Design a protein around this ligand. Structure first.
Ligand SMILES: Cc1ccc(NC(=O)c2ccnc(C(F)(F)F)c2)cc1-c1cc(OCCO)nc(N2CCOCC2)c1
Ligand SMILES: Cc1ccc(NC(=O)c2ccnc(C(F)(F)F)c2)cc1-c1cc(OCCO)nc(N2CCOCC2)c1
Lengths: 265, 255
């Protein structure tokens, strides 16, 4: 129950990515690990509470498709240790490296993602930021879901531009995060896999997306799916992207639908 | 708080049975491996052995240890872990005649050293480290666990003090040396000993030791040295897993 890692055991190695609130390094601790530490030693209360929360939901997860939480360190800096994964994100595969997956591989990635998301909702955990950049393809094969954003955490008076494409219309309106908003973002991930594209490719700017999607005048073009896309996947995709929250399926039914389709090959 | 309520796990195909428990393939947010007691009314030894098993598994979070996922208390005492595809290192090395590259053999030893170095840091003695409990998940990554089912077969990895009858971190290191022997020679130790009663007796008296010369010709010189150190007859002459892992990781980066 004590996943604290004493000072001096982790060798902080090469630096791999940083933003505001923390920097992530590759590390050595009984093998290869990924370490995320706060840049400072005197953390603000909001920074400290985000540390408690992140650990609090990570120590609640034990699943092959969730990034393996391994421990935390509080001295000299607040740090979080996870397993090290080789490869790149689904987003990098689909939209940067032009990686061509066979349809059998695309459905399998969707199935593993559905397993991890079905697990998170069973543990009463809303992901809040499910996008193809936070679906890691461990060794280009197994899915590891996490929150790889080094995003700036809320202050005492804050009330995204790389997550607008996966935001449900009610999240955009902000009048918000639920199991159904996670389901919507999953449908956009389904869209990426089945179409090979990001939604709203014919929309020049992001401000038009925010207002138009939030007002119901914009929806992803479902007609862009590849021809070898399974017919029952086109429907489940549209079911996840329904405008109203209480009409999109829950992940149990989502996973079962996809597990069936996989057995049909 | 890892309890899984009754009725959520779908028990599928049976994978193996013993005198007291059986393990099945299952469906619970994906594929899971479930091991259950055959009976419903468990004895104090069964209830407490169940607690101990869960108690040492819920302290493990490492890529090279079998991922503990949960347990259930109704109607049967069950323990749920991830499902791994493939077969054990023992099956690869001695039944399927799988030819691993020398680079891949050093990799398997390195991952195994990572899993054992992690277990010892958590103050956990394995007591049964053998090539049959080293699962090669998807023919690549190592998963160390206890895949043995008791039926009312681990002599080759027993230190002379364990055979004498005992278990410590150092005896776990010895079994690692025998696992190292398997990888570097492709054979089990004492291939030329007809019966096991002779192995138990001669190894316990120090008159029998693994033939280290049967190592493959391309075995790294420093792997020979580290193998013989892990198999040292005196307990306090065997290295600890921190120094073992560091040696293998250097060797692997040296290629
Ligand atoms: C280090 C770290 C600690 C905690 C967390 N926190 C979560 O994952 C999280 C937060 C909230 N909720 C959830 C939920 F899943 F439970 F919802 C999960 C992430 C990292 C981390 C960051 C990052 O940034 C670099 C991106 O390349 N790269 C990586 N690696 C790069 C590739 O090889 C290895 C992994 C690891
Ligand atoms: C089901 C189960 C529950 C608990 C446990 N508990 C430990 O492993 C354990 C306990 C204490 N300490 C450690 C340490 F490693 F951390 F020390 C590990 C094991 C199983 C289990 C049994 C087994 O029987 C083998 C059938 O061939 N096959 C598998 N599957 C083989 C095929 O694919 C997936 C895995 C899983």
């Amino acid at each position: 129950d004590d996943w604290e890692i004493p000072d001096g055991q982790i060798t902080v190695g090469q630096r791999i990515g940083s933003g505001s609130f923390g920097t992530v390094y590759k590390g050595k601790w009984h093998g290869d690990v990924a370490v995320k530490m706060l840049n400072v030693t005197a953390p603000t209360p909001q920074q400290l509470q985000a540390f408690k929360n992140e650990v609090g939901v990570l120590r609640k997860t034990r699943h092959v498709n969730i990034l393996l939480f391994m421990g935390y360190s509080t001295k000299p800096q607040l740090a979080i240790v996870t397993q090290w994964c080789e490869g790149s994100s689904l987003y990098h595969h689909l939209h940067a490296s032009e990686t061509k997956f066979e349809m059998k591989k695309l459905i399998d990635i969707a199935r593993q993602t559905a397993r991890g998301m079905d697990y998170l909702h069973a543990k009463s955990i809303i992901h809040r930021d499910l996008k193809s950049n936070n679906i890691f393809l461990h060794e280009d094969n197994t899915v590891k879901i996490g929150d790889f954003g080094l995003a700036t955490v809320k202050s005492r008076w804050s009330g995204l531009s790389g997550s607008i494409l996966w935001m449900a219309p009610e999240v955009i309106r902000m009048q918000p995060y639920s199991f159904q908003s996670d389901v919507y973002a999953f449908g956009i991930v389904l869209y990426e896999l089945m179409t090979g594209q990001l939604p709203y490719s014919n929309i020049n700017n992001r401000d038009q997306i925010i207002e138009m999607v939030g007002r119901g005048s914009l929806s992803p073009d479902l007609s862009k799916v590849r021809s070898n896309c399974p017919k029952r996947m086109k429907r489940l995709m549209a079911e996840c992207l329904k405008k109203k929250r209480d009409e999109r399926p829950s992940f149990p039914r989502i996973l079962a639908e996809i597990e069936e389709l996989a057995r049909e090959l």
